[PDB]
Structure 1
Amino acid sequence: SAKAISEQTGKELLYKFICTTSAIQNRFKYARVTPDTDWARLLQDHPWLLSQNLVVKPDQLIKRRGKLGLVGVNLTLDGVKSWLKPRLGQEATVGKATGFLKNFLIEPFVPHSQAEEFYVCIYATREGDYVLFHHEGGVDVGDVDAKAQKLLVGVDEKLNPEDIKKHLLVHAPEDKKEILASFISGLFNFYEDLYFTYLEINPLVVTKDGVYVLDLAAKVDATADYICKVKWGDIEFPPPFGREAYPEEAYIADLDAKSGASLKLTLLNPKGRIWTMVAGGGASVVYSDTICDLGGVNELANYGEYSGAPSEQQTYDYAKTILSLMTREKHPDGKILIIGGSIANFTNVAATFKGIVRAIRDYQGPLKEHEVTIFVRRGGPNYQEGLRVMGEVGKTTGIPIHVFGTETHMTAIVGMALGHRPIPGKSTTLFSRHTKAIVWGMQTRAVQGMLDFDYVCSRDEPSVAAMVYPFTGDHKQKFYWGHKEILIPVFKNMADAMRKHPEVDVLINFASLRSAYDSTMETMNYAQIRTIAIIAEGIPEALTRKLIKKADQKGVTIIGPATVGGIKPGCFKIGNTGGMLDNILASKLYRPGSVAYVSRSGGMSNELNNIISRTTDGVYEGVAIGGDRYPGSTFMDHVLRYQDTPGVKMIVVLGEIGGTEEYKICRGIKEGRLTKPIVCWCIGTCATMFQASETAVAKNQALKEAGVFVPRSFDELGEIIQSVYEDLVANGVIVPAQEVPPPTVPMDYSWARELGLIRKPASFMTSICDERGQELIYAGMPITEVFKEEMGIGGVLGLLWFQKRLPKYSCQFIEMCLMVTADHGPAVSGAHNTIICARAGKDLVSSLTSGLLTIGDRFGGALDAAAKMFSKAFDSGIIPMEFVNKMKKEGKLIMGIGHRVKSINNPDMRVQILKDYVRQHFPATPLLDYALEVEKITTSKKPNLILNVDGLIGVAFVDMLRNCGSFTREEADEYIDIGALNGIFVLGRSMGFIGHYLDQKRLKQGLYRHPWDDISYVLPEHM
C-alpha cells in the first residue's frame, strides 16, 4: 500500500516541514513544466530564472535519469526551452516501458565537486528503520546496499546524534561531519513525522555555502492519512512509467474513491479472448497464474482485484465498464469471460448477483454478436437464486454460459476454457474447546456466527464471554445459543470486562482502522489476553510495528492485521472465517481432521477449506495471517505450533510473492526442525510475465528443491494434497474419524431472506420517499436534483403529495395558498385552543395539536366543501341560474360564497391577489370563470355575498388539478375526494399555530381558567 510520490511534492514537503539548526539553501526554488506552460506566468513567478544557470529533469518516477541523457545540466532559460523542444510531448523507450514525457522540473544549478556528493537513504523493515549513508554519491554509486554505512534504528526509538558521529560518519571528511549530523538527525525526525517508508537522496551536496538537496525519491504510507493529512496537504501519487492509462481505468479508480471498497482495473491487452471478473484480492492472482500457465498468456486482457463487498450499483458500474470493453469489435475466435473467485466475508450475496445479471441483460444484443462464452463459478454460499437467474438469462439471451458449482476447482474452469478438458511467553495451543473470547466492537452478525458454530460443535459453553464497546452505555445483548436465547454482556471500559471475566484468553478486534492500534495498545497491558486478532485492513505500517514490538515485549500472539481470522473446527472459529453455517455444514468444518493450512491472503481461506474438505478428512486448524506488509505472526510461528501439535498430521502453506517469509521453511527443513509433510505453493508466478530470489517462481522452485511437496502449478494442488493423504492413510499414520451428524440450528431470517429461500409479502406499500441508498429520493427525483433546479416548497409539496412534478406557475401558486391561510387571527377557534394549551405550559407539538383537532366540518373545512360543490355542479351542466335557484329551493348555503363585512365595493384584498395571480398565469381557467358568474348572480341580491378565500382556493385547485400539464380528470377528481384540498389548510395554518404557541411562550403568561361570568349553569334540581 506504500505508494510513491513525485520528486517535486517530496521536495516541497521537505522544505515546508524540515526543522534543523544548519540552514538549507534554495528553499522553494523549483519550476513545474507542463505542455500547458504559461511561460509568462512562470516567469512572473520566478524572476531568478533569468539569473543563473538551470538544471531541467523529469519528475515521473524515472530511475537512472543521469544515464539516459535525460538531465539537462547547466543551461540558461533559452537553453532550457531549446532542450525542452525535442522532448516535451514526445516518447522515450525507458528500460522496458514506453510513455510520454509530459511533466518536467527546473531547479537551480549550484556548482559542486565530486567528493561533495553524499548518499542518504532511509527505509522501513520489520525490525525498524534503517539509515544508509555513503560518502560518495552520483550516478556511479553502484550497488549501495552492501557497500554503505548502515545503522539499525529500533521500532519506537530516537536517534542519538553521538551515535551518528561515531558510526555513520567514520569515512566522512572532518569539517563536514557536524553539519551532516545536523542534517540526518533532523531528517529522520521528518521521516518519523510524515510516515514515509522510503526516502532516498542521491546525491547530497554540502559545499561551503550550505546544504541543498538535488534529488528525492520517496514512498509514503497511504493508509496513514488520518494523522498526517493536514501535514500532507494536497498529495498526488504518480503511476509507474508506462503507457497512458485509459479513461476506463480512471473511471474504475474513481470507484475506489467515493466508496469504501477496493477495485482497481489494470488492463494490458484489449484484443484478447481471455477476460476476468474475479472477486477477491487473492484469487485474481490465482487466475492470472493459471491462465498464463496454460499458454493463453497472449490473449489475457486484464487482472483486477475486487473486495470489500461494495453496493450492487458499484458492481454494476464495474461490470458495465468491463462489458463495454467487451463489445467493441469482433475477434473470430471468441472471448472467454471468467467470473468467479474467493471471498471470506459474504455480506452482499444477494446484491452483487443483481449487478452482473443487470449488466449482462443490458447487452444481450452486442454480447451475442461479439461471441462471448462465459464461465461462472460460485463459491461459499449455495445462492441458488443467482445460479437460477444466470441459467434463465443464458437461455433468454442466447449467450452461452456455463454456471458451475463448488465441486469444480477454482482453476478447473481455466482448463475448461483453454481446450484441455470437456464440459460436463509464546504459546503452542492457542485455542482449546474451552476457549472464551471477547469481541471488541459491535458485530452481532459475527458473534451470532460464533455461537451457532459452537452449538454445531456440541460445545458445552459459548465462546463469546463478553463484548466491549466504548461508544454506548453498559447493557446486555440477546443472542441465540442454539434454540434458547442467552444473554451476552456489553461493556464500555475494559476493566469491567476484565474483572468480571477471568476466564477469557482471546480478544478479537473488529475495530476500525483508526482505532485498532489504540484498542490493541489498551488491551496489551493486561495479563490473560494471550491471543489478539486484528480484523481491520489499512492500518499504517508505522503503527503495526509498534504493535509487533509490544507483542514481543509481552508475548501475545497476533493473527493479523488484514486477516479474517482463522478457524479451528470442533473448538473455535474467528470472525467470519468459513462463512455462515450454510458453508460450514457443506465443507464439514464441525469436526476435527488431520490437515492444517496457513495462508497469506484471507480471501483464500474459503478455497482452502473447500479443497481440503474435498480430499481429506477435515481441517485441523487453518490460519490466515493477513494481507499486509507486516504480519503479526508470519508463516514460521504457526508452522512451529503445527509441528509441536499432536493432532496435526500434514501441513499446507499458501504463500504470495514478496519477502523472505518462505526461505525460512527451507532452512527449517534443512536444519531438520520441520518434520511433518508440507505441501506449499505461493501465488503469482506470472507476475513476471507482464529482487530475483523473492519472485514466486524461484521461491516455489527453492521450496521444491528442499523437500516441500510442491505441485507443478496451482491446478494440481488438490491432486497433490489428495496423493499425499492417500499415502498417509495407507501406512497406518492417520486413523480417520467416523463422521457423525451435528445438531442443527434454524437459519437466520435476515440471512435466509437474501439467499431467496423465504418468500413473504410486504406489509406496507409506500409510494413517496426512498430512505436507503446514497441520496434521498422523493417521488421520482433525488434531492440534489431538487436543489439543483429551483423546486421550492411549492414544488416539494406537489412532489410529495401528488407524486406528479408540477410546473412553475402552479408551484408559485401553491406557495400563495400557503402564504394566505397562515393566519386569520387569534380569536379563531383553532388559534384559541392553541393559545390555551400554550398557556397551560405544555410542548410545541401538544400546543399545535390541540388547535389542529379543531379543523373539521365547521372550522377550516370550507375549502373542501367549496370544491365538492362547484366542481360537482360544473359537471352536471347547470348554468348558474338553476344552480342558485336550487340552492334556494333545497335550502342550503353555498359553501364558497359569503363574507361577514365585505362587498363588491370593497373586496378582500387576498382574494384579489389570488384572482389576479390565477388570471395572469394559468393557461385556461374553467370553474373560476363559472364561479365568478355566481358571484354576480348572487351579489345582485345582497352586497356581502362574495366567494371567499375559502371558496377561491377550493376553486383554483380544482382548476389547477384539471388544467395542469400532468393529470387526468379521472385522477384529478381523486385528490379532491381524498381531501388534499382540505390538507392545504392544515399545512397553511400550522405556521400560524406554531406562531401562537411560540409567541405566548415568549410573552410569559400563566394558566388560563375561563371566568364564571360567561357560563350559564343549568343543573336539574334533584338533590
Structure 2
Amino acid sequence: SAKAISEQTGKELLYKFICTTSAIQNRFKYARVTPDTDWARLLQDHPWLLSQNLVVKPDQLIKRRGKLGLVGVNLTLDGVKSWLKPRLGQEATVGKATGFLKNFLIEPFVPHSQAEEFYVCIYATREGDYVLFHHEGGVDVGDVDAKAQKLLVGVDEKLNPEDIKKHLLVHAPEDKKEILASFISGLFNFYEDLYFTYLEINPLVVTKDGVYVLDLAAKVDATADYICKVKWGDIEFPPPFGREAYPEEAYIADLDAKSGASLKLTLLNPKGRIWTMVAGGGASVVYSDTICDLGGVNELANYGEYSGAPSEQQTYDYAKTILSLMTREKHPDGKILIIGGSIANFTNVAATFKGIVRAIRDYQGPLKEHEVTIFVRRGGPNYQEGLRVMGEVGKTTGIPIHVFGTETHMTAIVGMALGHRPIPGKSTTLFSRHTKAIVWGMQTRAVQGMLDFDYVCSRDEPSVAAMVYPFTGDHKQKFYWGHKEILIPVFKNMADAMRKHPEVDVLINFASLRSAYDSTMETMNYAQIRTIAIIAEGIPEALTRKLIKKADQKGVTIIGPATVGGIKPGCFKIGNTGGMLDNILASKLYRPGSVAYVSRSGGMSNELNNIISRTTDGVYEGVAIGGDRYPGSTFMDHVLRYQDTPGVKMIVVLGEIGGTEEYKICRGIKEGRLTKPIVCWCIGTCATMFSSEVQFGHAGACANQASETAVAKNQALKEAGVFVPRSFDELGEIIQSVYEDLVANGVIVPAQEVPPPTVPMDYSWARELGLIRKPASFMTSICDERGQELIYAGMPITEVFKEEMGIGGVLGLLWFQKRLPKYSCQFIEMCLMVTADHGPAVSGAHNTIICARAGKDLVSSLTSGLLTIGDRFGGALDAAAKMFSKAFDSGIIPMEFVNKMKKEGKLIMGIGHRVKSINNPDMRVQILKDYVRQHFPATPLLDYALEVEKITTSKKPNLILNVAGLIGVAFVDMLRNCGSFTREEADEYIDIGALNGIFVLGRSMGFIGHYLDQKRLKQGLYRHPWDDISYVLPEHM
C-alpha cells in the first residue's frame, strides 16, 4: 500500500538521509504554518526568515498549485503574512475535490534561471524502477514519457554513475555532469533504502553554490514500516485534499498495523446514513459499487473491510469504533448498517459476529434511539452461529436486524436497504491428483481441510507430505484421512523435509509478512518445488519484486502474496481455499467442471465458486492471485495456462481497479492467442463516483493513470469480444448464458454426478450443534480456568485481591469453597507460619537434604521429603483433631477421657513435649493460643483440650498441649464455630484430611528452603557411615 507523504516529511527525510558528494543546500530549511499556532514561536527558532526572501505554498498533497495560483513567489515575511490571510483557513476547490487549507510551507526563495529547471522522477514498476530526467523541467516540462530520458534499473541492480552520465545526462550542461549525476545516484540510493515507491522532484535547480529542491511528491510503501520505523520516525501520511481525516481512522490504521489481519476504514461522508461491515477488499469494493449503482454514493458514509480472520477483540473494537462514528449525528430517515461479505474461506464467522454482537450490546441505546437498521449477509466457517447470535442480539436489543445466508446473492441486502426490492520455464499444469505439498508453519486446521478435500476427491494419497515449523523439533502430527488416523512428519528445517520427500512439488508458505520473504527465498533454492503459494499480507513491494525476479530466473510459479491460494477440484487445494468441507460439498468442488476462473480477491473466489457451481457444470480450476500491487503470477500466466489446458472450456476473469492487466487480455485475444470463451468483470466502478482518491483494502487497488479505471477496462473488454456483464449482479446470468450457449453446441459434455466419499463429522462440531452426548469423566468445583477471568470457587481473582485476601483467604476458597472471615484467614496463615520448618533433624527435612545433596531437583527433593509426612511424622495434627473431636462429641469429661485412654493403651494425640514443660512453653503454642483467645468467637474444643492438658500436666510437667494438638483443636473450633460451615461440612473436612494438607503446605516452605540451602552451600553426595549401620545379616541363606 503506497501512501503519499507530505512535502515537509519528504524533504526532511531527504535532508537527513541523503548521501551525496554534492553540496546539498538548504538542509532542514523550512517552516510549517498552521492556523492553530502562535507566530513569534515560529520566529525565534527560525532566524533565517528575515535573512533571505521567502516563498509560501500549501503542503496538503496539492498539485498544480502554480497553475491554480495557490503559490506566492518572491514575497517578504510581511508579504507572506499578508498573503496567508485571504487563503489561510479558507475554502478551496482543486479539480473535483474541495477542502480547507490547514497546512502551509515557508522556504527561502532561490534565484534560479529557466536553463537550470530540472525534472527528476523515480517510480517503481514490476520489472524495476524507472528514472525520468528532463533538462527543460518545471512548468514547461510538457510531455514526460516522450521527451524526458528514461532509464530502467532492474531489481537487485545498482545504478552506477556512468550509466546515468551516458543515458541520462545528454542534454544537460557539461560543467555540471559530475555533481548532478552523483546527486542522482545519491537520490537513487535514497529511493530503495527507505522503500520509496514514487519520488518526483520538480523544479530542481543547480547553481555554482549547490543544488536546491523546490517541490517533491513522494509516495512510500507503508507496509515496509517494520523495516524503516527507525528511519521514518513518527512519519505521518496526510489524507487527500478534501478528506478531513479523523482520529478513528488513525485508530483503525494502528489496529491494522498491530496484527497480520487487515482492518481498513475510511470516512467518506460522516453525515451519511449507510455503513458497511463487509469482509475482504474485493467484497468491500463490490458492495461499494452495488451501493453507488442505486444512487447511494452521496449518502455512503464509510468504506471499510476486515480480512485476515480478525479475532474476537479486533472485530469488537472495529465494530465499536464504527458504531460510535454512526452515533454522532441523527438522520431523519434513519441509518443503515450493512454487515456483508463473501463466503469466508477461513475467517471464523462465529468469532467476528460475536464481537459485532458484543459491540451492538454495548451501543444498543444510541442505536435504538438513532433508528438504525441492520442487514446482514454472510457465509463461511461456522456462519450458522454468527447468523443466530445476530438473531438473538437483534431480538433482545430490539434493533431491526435482518440476517440472510448463502442463498442471498450478496447484493440483495443492498437493494433491501435502499428500498429497491422487498425483504423476504513455468509449467502449464501446476496441480494434479498426485501433487504433494509441504506446509510451512503450524496450520493444522488448513492441513486438515486439505486432507478432507483430498479424501472427498478420492485421492490415493494426502496432498500434504510434510510440515515445516522452525520453532519445534522433528516429530509427527496426527491427522485424519477420512476416518482413519495418519501421521504427517513435521521438521524443524526445510532441508530435511526436502531431503526425505523428493516427490514434493508445491510449497504453501504460511509464514508471516516478516518471514515470507526469507522462507520463499530459501525454498526457491530447491529445484523440486515448482509452485509456491504465499499467504502473508503486507509484504513490502520491493521484497515481492525480488521474489518475482528470482522465481522468473528459476522458473517457479508464485501464487501472489496476500491470497487464500487456489483450488483444483478433484486434484488439489491450497490452504483454506473453498471454506470448510461443507462449502466444498455444497459447491460440488470435489469433481472437475469446465469453467476456470482467476480473481484478485480470496473470498470473491469463493463467491465465484458458488456462482459457477449454481449456474454451470462446475469449476475445473480456480486461482486467486492476491490483492498485492505486484502478484507473483499475473492474469497472463493463469489465462495462458487455462488456454493451453484442454480440460477447460470457458474462462472467467474477475479483476479490480488499477493496473493495465486486462488490456493484456484484450491484446492476447486480438491476434487469437485466446480462443476459448472469456467472461471478464472489473470491480471498482464506484471509484469513478467518489470525489477523492480513496485507497481500497487491496494494496494493488490503486489506479495511477486514467486508463486503469474499472469502466475503461470493462468497456475495452466489451469491444475486445469478452462477455462483460452490466454489473456484478448480472455476472451469474451472463455466465449461465455463456455456459448454455457452449453446451448447446456440444463443446461441453457434463459428466454423471458420482457421490463423493463420506467424511465423519467432527466431535467438537457435533457438540457445538448439540447433536451428541458424552458423559464427563471428571468433576471439579474449586477453580474455573476457562472464561475471561480466573475464578477461585466462585470469586474472581480481581475480587480476590480487592477484598484484601491473603494466603489464608485463597486457601479457604480453594479448599473449603467458603468466604472465611478475616480472623480465620489470619489464623490459617499463622498455622502455616508455625509449621513452616522445625529443623533438619526431622525425617522429611533429612530426606529433602539427602535428595538435594544428590543434585537431583527441587521438585524431587521436596517430594522425597514430603513422602515421609504420615502417621509418625506430620500426622499428629489430624490425629489430635480427630481424637479430641471424638472425645468432645462423646460427652465424657476430660478426666474420664484421660483415664479411658490410659486404660486402653493409646497415647493422647497432641499432648507431650520433650524439654519445654512449665515456665517455658513451646512459645509458638502461646502465640496461636493468644490469637485464638483474642479473635475466635467460641472455642469449646480448645477449652476441652486445655482441661485435658491441665489434668495431664499434674502427671508430668512435659505433658502439655503440643503445636500439633493446639493447631488441630483450634482448626476444628474454627471449622465448627464460624458460620461458613455446618457440623457435617466440618466433620467431612476433618475426616478427609484438611489438617494433613495444612501441615504439608506449611512444611513445604521449610523443605524448599532446605533444598535451596543445600544447593547454596554446594554439598556433595551423602553416604551413611558404616559404623552406624550395624549389619545383622544371617549366616547363610
Fold match, TM over 0.5?
Answer: yes
Q: In structure 2, do the counterparts of structure 1 residues 713 and 116 end up closer, same or farther at CA, with 3 Å as the change threshold?
A: same
Does the CA-based 8 Å contact 2:468-2:491 persist in structure 1? yes
Match of 1:189 in 2: 189
* Contact 1:658–1:695, Cα closer than 8 Å, also in 2: yes
Give the C-alpha shift of residue 717 in structure 1. 1.1
| CA shift in 2, pair 1:1009/1:161, >3 Å | closer
Instruction: Indicate the SS of the match to 1:390.
Output: helix
User: Once the two structures are superposed, what CA deviation does each residue of 1:714-734 show, in whole Å capped at 9, x if it has no partner?
Assistant: 111111111222222223332
Alpha-carbon deviation of 1:503? 3.7
Q: How many angstroms does 1:823 deviate by?
A: 2.5
In structure 2, what is the Cα distance between the partners aligned to 1:224 and 1:234? 14
CA gap of 1:227–1:357, structure 2 versus 1, over 3 A, is closer
Q: 1:437 to 1:973 in 2, by over 3 A?
A: same
Question: Is the contact between residue 535 and residue 562 of structure 2 (CA under 8 Å) also seen in structure 1?
Answer: yes
Q: Which residue of 1 aligns with 2:403?
A: 403
Secondary structure, aligned partner of 2:994: coil
Q: Given that residues 385 and 755 in structure 1 are in contact (C-alpha distance below 8 angstroms), is that contact kept between their aligned partners in structure 2?
A: no
Deviation at 1:678, TM superposition (A): 1.5
Q: Does the 8 Å contact 1:122/1:200 carry over to 2?
A: yes
Moved more, 1012-1021 or 162-171: 1012-1021
By how many angstroms is 1:370 displaced? 4.7
Greater CA deviation, 512-521 or 473-482?
473-482
Specify the alignment match of 1:960 in structure 2. Answer: 974
Per-residue CA deviation, residues 815-835 of structure 1 (Å, 9 max, x unaligned), is 766555432211223212222
Task: Tell me how far apart the structure 2 counterparts of residues 968 and 82 of structure 1 sit (CA, whole Å).
Answer: 89
1:906 alignment partner, SS class = coil
Structure 1 residues 858-867 or 109-118, which shifts more? 858-867
The CA distance in 2 between the partners of 1:93 and 1:324, in whole Å, is: 30
Q: Which residue of 2 aligns with 1:980?
A: 994
Distance 2:38 2:595 in 1: 67
CA shift in 2, pair 1:780/1:474, >3 Å: same
Query: Would you say the 8 A contact 1:282–1:603 is kept in 2?
Result: yes
Q: How does 1:715-726 map to 2 (within 5 A)?
A: 715-726=729-740
Contact 1:199 1:217 in 2 (8 A): yes
2:237 & 2:229 partners in 1: Cα distance?
14
What is the total number of aligned residue pairs between the two structures? 1022
Give the distance between the partners of 1:260 and 1:869, measured in 2 at CA.
65
Identity across aligned pairs (percent)? 100
8 Å CA contact 2:345–2:381 kept in 1: the answer is: no
Q: 1:795 offset after TM fit, Å?
A: 7.9
- Say yes or no: does 1:628 pair with 2:628: yes
- More displaced stretch, 157-166 vs 209-218: 209-218
For 2:125 and 2:671, the matched residues in 1 are separated by 26
RMSD: 4.7
Identify if the C-alpha distance between structure 1 residues 871 and 359 changes in structure 2 by more than 3 Å, giving closer, same or farther: farther
1:486-526, CA deviations, whole angstroms, 9 ceiling, x for partnerless residues? 44444455555545545443333233323322232233344
Structure 1 residues not aligned, in runs of 5+: none
Give how far 1:781 is off. Answer: 9.2
Question: Which deviations, in whole Å up to 9, do the C-alpha atoms of 1:553-593 show, x marking residues without a partner?
Answer: 23322221112222111222222221222111111112222
Query: Does the CA-based 8 Å contact 2:354-2:389 persist in structure 1?
Result: no
| Inter-CA distance 35–1018: structure 2 relative to 1 (3 Å threshold) | farther
Relative to structure 1, the CA distance from residue 971 to residue 636 in structure 2 (aligned partners, 3 Å threshold; closer, same or farther) is farther
Q: CA deviation at 1:766?
A: 5.3
Separation of aligned partners in 1, 2:512 and 2:76: 54
After TM superposition, the structure 1 stretch with the greater mean CA deviation from structure 2, 870-879 or 25-34, is 870-879
How much has 1:843 moved relative to structure 2? 2.6
3-state SS of 1:626 partner: coil
Deviation of 1:928 after TM superposition, in Å, equals 9.6
8 Å Cα contact 1:807-1:965 kept in structure 2: no
Alpha-carbon deviation of 1:183? Answer: 0.6
Question: Is it true that 1:337 corresponds to 2:332 in the alignment?
Answer: no
Q: For the residues of structure 2 that align with 1:607 and 1:827, how far apart are their CA atoms?
A: 77
TM-score, normalised to structure 1, is: 0.86
Separation (CA, whole Å) in 2 of partners of 1:368 and 1:59: 43
Deviation at 1:184, TM superposition (A): 0.8
Q: How far apart, in 1, do the equivalents of 2:330 and 2:9 lie?
A: 44
- Aligned partners of 1:186, 1:502: CA distance in 2, in Å? 47
Query: CA contact under 8 A between 1:350 and 1:755: conserved in structure 2?
Result: no
Q: C-alpha displacement at 1:922, in angstroms?
A: 11
Q: What per-residue deviation string (whole Å, max 9, x for no partner) do you get for residues 28-74 of structure 1?
A: 44455667758787767555566555555554434345566665666
Q: Supply the distance in 1 between the matched residues of 2:319 and 2:667 (Cα, whole angstroms).
A: 45
- Distance in 1 (CA, whole Å) between partners of 2:140 and 2:889 is 99
Cα deviation, 1:313-364, whole Å, max 9, x if unaligned, reads: 3323333444455566765545443323125532524423433344455666
**Contact kept? 2:567, 2:622, Cα under 8 Å:** yes
The answer on whether the counterparts of 1:350 and 1:754 sit within 8 Å (CA) in structure 2 is no
Distance in 1, matches of 2:474 and 2:857, equals 31
Q: Secondary structure of 1:725's partner?
A: helix
**Separation (CA, whole Å) in 2 of partners of 1:890 and 1:511:** 77
SS at 1:119's partner residue? strand
The 1:182–1:274 alpha-carbon spacing in structure 2 relative to 1, beyond 3 Å, is closer
Asked if the contact 1:199–1:219 (Cα under 8 Å) also holds between the matched residues in 2, the reply is: yes
The change in CA–CA distance for 1:395 and 1:46 in structure 2 (over 3 A counts) is closer
Deviation track 1:204-236 (CA, whole Å, cap 9, x = no partner) reads 232222234444432222222443334344433
> How far does the alpha carbon of each residue in 1:538-557 deviate from its partner, in whole angstroms, 9 at most, with x for none?
22111111222222223322
State the alpha-carbon separation in 1 of the partners of residues 398 and 62 from structure 2.
Answer: 49
Taking the TM superposition and a 5 Å limit, the aligned residue runs for 1:278-677 are 278-325=278-325, 331=331, 333-346=333-346, 348-360=348-360, 370-381=370-381, 383-391=383-391, 399-498=399-498, 500-677=500-677
The Cα shift of 1:944 comes to 7.2
Q: Could you tell me how far apart the structure 2 residues matched to 1:1008 and 1:523 are?
A: 56
Structure-2-length-normalised TM-score: 0.85
Moved more, 67-76 or 536-545: 67-76
- Alignment check: 8 A CA contact 2:477 2:488 kept: yes
Sort the Cα spacing of 1:918 and 1:13 in 2 relative to 1 into closer, same or farther, 3 A. farther
Report if the CA contact (8 A) 2:199-2:218 is conserved: yes
Of residues 846-855 and 792-801 in structure 1, the stretch that sits farther from structure 2 once superposed is 792-801
How far did residue 534 of structure 1 move? 2.0
Unaligned runs of 5+ in 2: 690-704
Is the Cα–Cα contact under 8 Å of residues 343 and 579 in structure 2 kept in the other structure?
A: no
Mean CA deviation greater in 417-426 or 552-561:
417-426
Distance 2:96 2:973 in 1: 76
Equivalent residues of 1:663, 1:703 under 8 A apart: yes
1: distance between equivalents of 2:250 and 2:890?
A: 65
Whole-angstrom CA distance in 1 between matches of 2:213 and 2:77 = 21
* Preserved contact between residue 60 and residue 240 of structure 1 (Cα < 8 Å): yes
Give CA-to-partner distance per residue, 1:159-217, whole Å, 9 cap, x none.
12112112212222222221111111112112122221112223323222223444443
User: 2:350–2:381: 8 Å Cα contact kept in structure 1?
Assistant: no
Question: Which has the higher mean CA deviation after the structures are superposed, 200-209 or 82-91?
Answer: 82-91
Shift in CA distance, 817/399, structure 1 to aligned 2, threshold 3 Å? same
Q: 1:773 to 1:86 in 2, by over 3 A?
A: farther
Matched, 1:1007 2:1007: no
Distance 1:390 1:613 in 2: 28
Question: Which stretch of structure 1 is more off in the superposition, 24-33 or 305-314?
Answer: 24-33
State the distance in 2 between where 1:970 and 1:85 align.
Answer: 88
Q: Is the 8 A contact 2:433 2:459 kept in 1?
A: yes
Residues 993 and 608 (structure 1 numbering): CA distance in 2 closer, same or farther, change over 3 Å? same
Separation in 2, partners of 1:888, 1:85:
110
- Deviation of 1:926 after TM superposition, in Å, equals 12
Aligned partners of 1:463 and 1:714: how far apart in 2?
Answer: 34
1:695 and 1:875 map into 2 onto residues whose CA distance is 94
